Structure 1
Amino acid sequence: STGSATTTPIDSLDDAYITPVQIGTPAQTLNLDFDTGSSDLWVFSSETTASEVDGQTIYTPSKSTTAKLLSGATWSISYGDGSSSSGDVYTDTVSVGGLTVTGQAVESAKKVSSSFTEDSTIDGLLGLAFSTLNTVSPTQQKTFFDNAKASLDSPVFTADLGYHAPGTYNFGFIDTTAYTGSITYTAVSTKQGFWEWTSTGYAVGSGTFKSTSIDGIADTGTTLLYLPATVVSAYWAQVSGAKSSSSVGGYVFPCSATLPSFTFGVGSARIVIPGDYIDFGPISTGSSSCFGGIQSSAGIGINIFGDVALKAAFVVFNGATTPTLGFASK
């Protein structure tokens, strides 16, 4: 089997991408944030505290003839940005782009933190990291990809995120028309439960490539590119007037600036992030200070190749017995 679904930016900045997912019988379609940095499929639901729902579409398990309470199971998750959610668990039929999994754990939120409530466009998350990170207790549950894997034509999924435009998540096949050149594959460590890999270096604009190992994670659920402070300083030094602002929470730059590109290495190959992709717009409405899309990871504990980086590439998440990542230009 295969599946193919369009993913759409939630706003004009590409802050996140939503993909429609069919849950239950008859189908209830929710727009989920596919997150290669986590491993829970959780949804706003008929059980979510009413004051914490503000415009989201909810899953109502009592209206699904295939839903079953997973007795005793609870979940609770906290994300790198400080947001969180928790609740109980149902199993139900879940379909993405024509690919169907029966018996998928659907984690129903009883509580969500304010950042989720305040974003009416995201109805939940669909985790695509390794199932060892799934938070369901006392019996850990498998991700949608893990459950689908054996049925897929090939045990892979691909992320093709758009810049200010829709893109595609495919399951079970690699669309050879969706990229240019060849795909360069690189080794993955699953020791932390992430799609963790080592970039071979970087360049700023037309500058020389610096060969240096940068370990990090491929995370579709993080907006920006978080890298070591040395690398980030070298980037913003090429933008007149750019500076790190403790009050704003990162590097800002004059909105009148033209930003240089940023290249990262994948083995001997190179992925170029155009300068435009690094502009996240005014810090507040009407401001002439703009927020940068490359930020320091120093306070995180891990480097994160988020959407800023991933949307410059066609990305293969190869879930074979020994997983690997592939990157192609597009």
Structure 2
Amino acid sequence: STGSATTTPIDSLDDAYITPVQIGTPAQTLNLDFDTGSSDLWVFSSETTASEVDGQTIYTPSKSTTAKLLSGATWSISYGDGSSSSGDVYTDTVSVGGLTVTGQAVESAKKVSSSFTEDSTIDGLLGLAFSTLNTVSPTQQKTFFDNAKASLDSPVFTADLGYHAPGTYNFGFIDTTAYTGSITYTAVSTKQGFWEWTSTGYAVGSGTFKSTSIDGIADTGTTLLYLPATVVSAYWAQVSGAKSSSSVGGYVFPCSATLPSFTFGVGSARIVIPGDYIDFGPISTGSSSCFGGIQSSAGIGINIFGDVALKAAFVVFNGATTPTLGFASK
């Protein structure tokens, strides 16, 4: 089997992407944030504290003839950005782009943190990291991909995120029309539960390529590109007036600037992030200080190839017995 679904930016900055997901019988369609940095499929629901729901579409398990309470199971998650959610668990039928999993754990939120409430466009998350990170207790649950894998034509999914435009998540096949040149594959460590890999270096603009190993994760659920402070300083030094602002929480730059591109290495191959992808707009409405899309990972404890990086590539998440990651230009 295969599946194919369009993923759509939630706003004009590509702060996140939402993909429609069918849950239950009859289908309840919720728009979920597909997150290769976590491993829980959780939703706003009829159980979510009323004051914490603000415009989201909810899953109502009592209206699904295929929903079953997973008795005794609870979940609780905290994300790198300080947000969180928790609740109980149902199993139900879940379909993405025509690909159906029966008995998928659907984690129903009883509580969500303010960041989730305040984002009316995101009805929940669909985790696509390794199932070892799933938070369900006392019986850990599998991700949608892990459950689908054996049925797929090939044990893969691909992320093709758009810049200020829709893109595509495919399951079970590689669309050879969706990228240019060849796909370069690179090794993955699953030791921390992530799609963790090592970039071979970087360049800033038309500058020379610096060969250096950068360990990090491919994370569709993180907006920006978080890299070591040395790398990030080298980038922003090429933008007149750019500075790290402790008050704002990262690098800012004059909105009048033209940003240079940023290149990262995948083996001997190179992915070029155009400068415009690195512009996250005014820090507040009407400001002439703009927020940068490349930020320091110092104090996160891991480098993160988030959407800023991934949307410059066609990315293969290869879930074969020994997982790997593939990157192509597009």
Q: How far 1:261 sits from its partner (Å)?
A: 0.1
Size of the alignment, in residue pairs? 330
Q: Displacement of 1:63 after TM fit? A: 0.1
Equivalent-residue separation in structure 2 for 1:201 and 1:54 (angstroms): 43
Are 1:39 and 2:39 matched, yes or no? yes
Deviations 1:22-45 (A, max 9, x none): 000000000000000000000000
Q: C-alpha deviations, 1:132-171, integer Å up to 9, x for none? A: 0000000000000000000000000000000000000000
| CA deviation vs aligned residue, 1:106-137 (integer Å, no higher than 9, x gap) | 00000000000000000000000000000000
CA distance in 2, matches of 1:81, 1:170: 27
Q: Tell me the distance in 1 between the aligned counterparts of 2:31 and 2:244.
A: 35
Aligned-partner SS, 2:312: coil
Shift in Å at residue 293 of structure 1?
0.1
Deviations 1:50-71 (A, max 9, x none): 0000000000000000000000
Say which SS state the counterpart of residue 277 (structure 2) adopts: helix
Q: d(CA) in 1 for partners of 2:269 and 2:93?
A: 40
- After superposition, what is the alpha-carbon deviation per residue over 1:265-307, rounded to whole angstroms, capped at 9, x for unaligned? 0000000000000000000000000000000000100000000
2-structure distance, mates of 1:247, 1:165: 31
SS of the residue corresponding to residue 149 of structure 1 reads helix
Alpha-carbon distance in 2 for matches of 1:19, 1:276: 24
Q: Deviations over 1:4-39 (max 9, x none)?
A: 000000000000000000000000000000000000
Structure 2 counterpart SS, 1:298: coil
**Structure 2, gaps ≥5 residues long:** none
Cα distance between partner residues in 1 of 2:121 and 2:228: 32
Q: Shift in Å at residue 81 of structure 1?
A: 0.2
> In structure 2, the residue corresponding to 1:11 is in which secondary structure?
coil
TM-score normalized with structure 2 length? 1.00
TM-aligned CA deviation for residue 73 of structure 1: 0.0
Instruction: Name the CA distance, whole Å, in 2 between partners of 1:297 and 1:167.
Output: 27
Q: Tell me, in whole angstroms, the C-alpha distance in 2 between the residues paired with 1:58 and 1:234.
A: 45
Q: Distance in 1 between matches of 2:270 and 2:201?
A: 9
SS in 2 for 1:322: coil
- Secondary structure of 2:290 counterpart: strand
Supply the distance in 1 between the matched residues of 2:168 and 2:251 (Cα, whole angstroms): 30
CA deviations over 1:65-103 (Å, ceiling 9, x no partner)? 000000000000000000000000000000000000000
CA distance in 2, matches of 1:175, 1:6: 14
Once the two structures are TM-superposed, the CA of residue 250 in structure 1 deviates from its matched residue by 0.1
Structure 2 distance, partners of 1:73, 1:172, is: 30
1:61 matched to 2:61: yes
- For 1:19 and 1:262, locate their aligned partners in 2 and report how far apart those are by CA, in whole Å: 28
Aligned mates of 1:107, 1:169 — CA distance in 2: 22
Mapped to 2, the partners of 1:207 and 1:81 lie a distance apart of 32
Q: What is the rounded CA distance, in whole Å, between the counterparts of 1:63 and 1:287 in structure 2?
A: 47
- Normalised TM-score (structure 1): 1.00
Whole-Å separation in 1 of the counterparts to 2:261 and 2:73: 47
Q: Where do 5+ consecutive residues of structure 1 fail to align?
A: none
Q: Structure 2 CA distance, aligned partners of 1:277 and 1:165? A: 12
Q: Distance in 2 between matches of 1:84 and 1:123?
A: 14
Cα distance per residue 1:183-242 (max 9 Å; x no partner):
000000000000000000000000000000000000000000000000000000000000
CA distance in 1, matches of 2:120, 2:207: 42
Secondary structure (helix, strand or coil) at the match of 2:154 reads coil
Post-superposition offset of 1:310: 0.0
SS at match of 2:29: strand
Q: C-alpha separation between the residues in 1 aligned to 2:220 and 2:276?
A: 19
Percent identical: 100
Over 6 Å off, 4+ runs: none
Q: Does 1:27 align with 2:27?
A: yes
Equivalent residue number for residue 154 of structure 2: 154
Which string of whole-angstrom CA distances, capped at 9 and with x for unpartnered residues, describes residues 241-267 of structure 1?
000000000000000000000000000
